[PDB]
């Protein structure tokens, strides 16, 4: 057993990997989000910062829940990263509603997550999760929704105009 | 023989002048595309900048040519620079896919250059083509793609609002 | 066919489409590694810390290759990231051979890229790649050849004390 | 009953004071610690400024349960601080390894504390460990673990060389 450990549920520790294995996917998702928005023929270059930033965000989670499970004693076991379910995200509405999914579901395991710290009575890790990803997650699915009521109000995505004037006055 | 002349073969040196005429008539399609959008009856300034500002990146691009053809020992020989195809570039839009053809057509010319300086055996004259110019183009012709698909998603040339706002926001 | 598209065989599309994802891999290694000198168990901070800077570093290397392809009007296609060969990198010295071994392969995929680029006669990616990777590899190459000489010379993997006196005076 | 009391239960209270106790004594154990290393047969700097860092901690973490106490409207009770278990630490790795036991002992009495007020249905005290004391613990014993781990690996308590190295090293 590692020197380290103390309270730390085995299932805790899988569940941990697990997640970290879900955050590098939401960091390929957003990645790819991004360079199709650089594509010649979407050329909206806001949102492709947007979600490059978003990519970035998402590694940035994954590296804290490596750095937690080295704290706690846990050992890191990695899986592979699955590629994003579309290579063509059709339009700036179509990649924010997939990312409004998208975040749905990571919160969906994290409080799943939250959960079985709960039920395995590990507050360490409960506060964990509460101070690093809860309230980011409903600050990131309110934004997403904003975005995503904003382009229907606008027209999008039959409006390009829409599109191209969101990518400016919200994104920019 | 010039005194500095070495492993530059005639044919390159002829495809140098050639290339600076091309150069040079880049330069002027791009003037007159400028001039065009400060018409008291297009009235586009931030078009009549960007392509201003184009004319002149050319006018350099040819400076550099006939340096290079000095530098290696070649001698300039200069022809007239026809008149650009189009005295009414019609719109927005339109002026920017005929500066799409343009720099298509220039990119297809260095092409042909670099075949030439590989077949002659001229590292030299091959990276000062790579260097300079062949990136350029590729940065040129996908900055104008880019451009032309937001113009049309916009829904231009029939919506003299959509050009408007691409010269605001896109232009300025 | 995109409107930017020109001299860009489609086998030099798909070549690239491949090594994005060796250089996405090759970021997943490092990451991996990073983490492991971060255990409790091994507590090699700057051994973690190099490793988690050449982890960025080729993710860098993967969107500049994204970058490229929209450049030059190829489609991106992902695929999985693979996990990496071991989860149990056994010391400081057995990880800088395994990354030696590593940017060797990414090297061969590399030149064999510049072969296909040389023989469909692209000369915007032959020096895209010089420019941006060939050297780039030789350098790591040979910095990880000379952290592999000290870390054998000074007793390493049976010495700890090597281990922990190359963390600090080397990479700190 | 004092004006300010609410939801606070008499067992949280005791369990407060027995806490104050606990911080005290972890603060003596590193105390003594400190000037151990400070004897001239002994003679490691770095050690000693290490422990009497994480001593004056340990009466921080003591004053702030105090305030607590007072800020719930509990009373404090104080108890005499018992002299740490050794007189004589051994060696730079014997001391690491006993505050590595120390610090799982703080933390074992912090969990408890938390199992109490989650009992009581407290959020406030429960939040009050989470956030000013769990963390705290699980940094701490990630720290020694990984300063237990490279003494051992560098050959410590024999060498005395390691743990002047480690003395220059890693506490300097
Ligand atoms: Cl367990
Ligand atoms: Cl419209
Ligand atoms: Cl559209
Ligand atoms: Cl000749
Ligand atoms: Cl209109
Ligand atoms: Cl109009
Ligand atoms: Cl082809
Ligand atoms: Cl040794
Ligand atoms: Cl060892
Ligand atoms: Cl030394
Ligand atoms: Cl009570
Ligand atoms: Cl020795
Ligand atoms: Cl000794
Ligand atoms: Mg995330
Ligand atoms: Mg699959
Ligand atoms: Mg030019
Ligand atoms: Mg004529
Ligand atoms: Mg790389
Ligand atoms: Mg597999
Ligand atoms: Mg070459
Ligand atoms: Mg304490
Ligand atoms: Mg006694
Ligand atoms: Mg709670």
Same mark, same amino acid.
């Given at each position: 057993?590692?020197?380290?450990?103390?309270?730390?549920?085995?299932?805790?520790?899988?569940?941990?990997?697990?997640?970290?294995?879900?955050?590098?996917?939401?960091?390929?998702?957003?990645?790819?989000?991004?360079?199709?928005?650089?594509?010649?023929?979407?050329?909206?270059?806001?949102?492709?910062?947007?979600?490059?930033?978003?990519?970035?965000?998402?590694? /940035?989670? =994954?590296?804290? %829940?490596? &750095?937690?499970? +080295? #704290?706690?004693?846990?050992?890191?076991?990695?899986?592979?990263?699955? $590629?994003?379910?579309?290579?063509?995200?059709?339009?700036?509405?179509?990649?924010? /509603?997939? =990312?409004?999914? %998208?975040? &749905?579901?990571? +919160? #969906?395991?994290?409080?799943?997550?939250?959960?079985?710290?709960?039920? $395995?009575?590990?507050?360490?890790?409960?506060?964990?999760?509460?101070?690093?990803?809860?309230?980011?997650?409903?600050?990131?699915?309110?934004?997403?929704?904003?975005?995503?009521?904003?382009?229907?109000?606008?027209?999008?995505?039959?409006?390009?105009?829409?599109?191209?004037?969101?990518?400016?006055?919200?994104?920019?």
């Amino acid at each position: 057993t590692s020197q380290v450990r103390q309270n730390y549920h085995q299932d805790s520790e899988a569940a941990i990997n697990r997640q970290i294995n879900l955050e590098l996917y939401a960091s390929y998702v957003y990645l790819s989000m991004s360079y199709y928005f650089d594509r010649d023929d979407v050329a909206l270059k806001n949102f492709a910062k947007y979600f490059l930033h978003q990519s970035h965000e998402e590694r /940035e989670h =994954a590296e804290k %829940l490596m &750095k937690l499970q +080295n #704290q706690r004693g846990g050992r890191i076991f990695l899986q592979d990263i699955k $590629k994003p379910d579309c290579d063509d995200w059709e339009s700036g509405l179509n990649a924010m /509603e997939c =990312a409004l999914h %998208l975040e &749905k579901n990571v +919160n #969906q395991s994290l409080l799943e997550l939250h959960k079985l710290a709960t039920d $395995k009575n590990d507050p360490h890790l409960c506060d964990f999760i509460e101070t690093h990803y809860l309230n980011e997650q409903v600050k990131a699915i309110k934004e997403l929704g904003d975005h995503v009521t904003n382009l229907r109000k606008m027209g999008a995505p039959e409006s390009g105009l829409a599109e191209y004037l969101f990518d400016k006055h919200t994104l920019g």
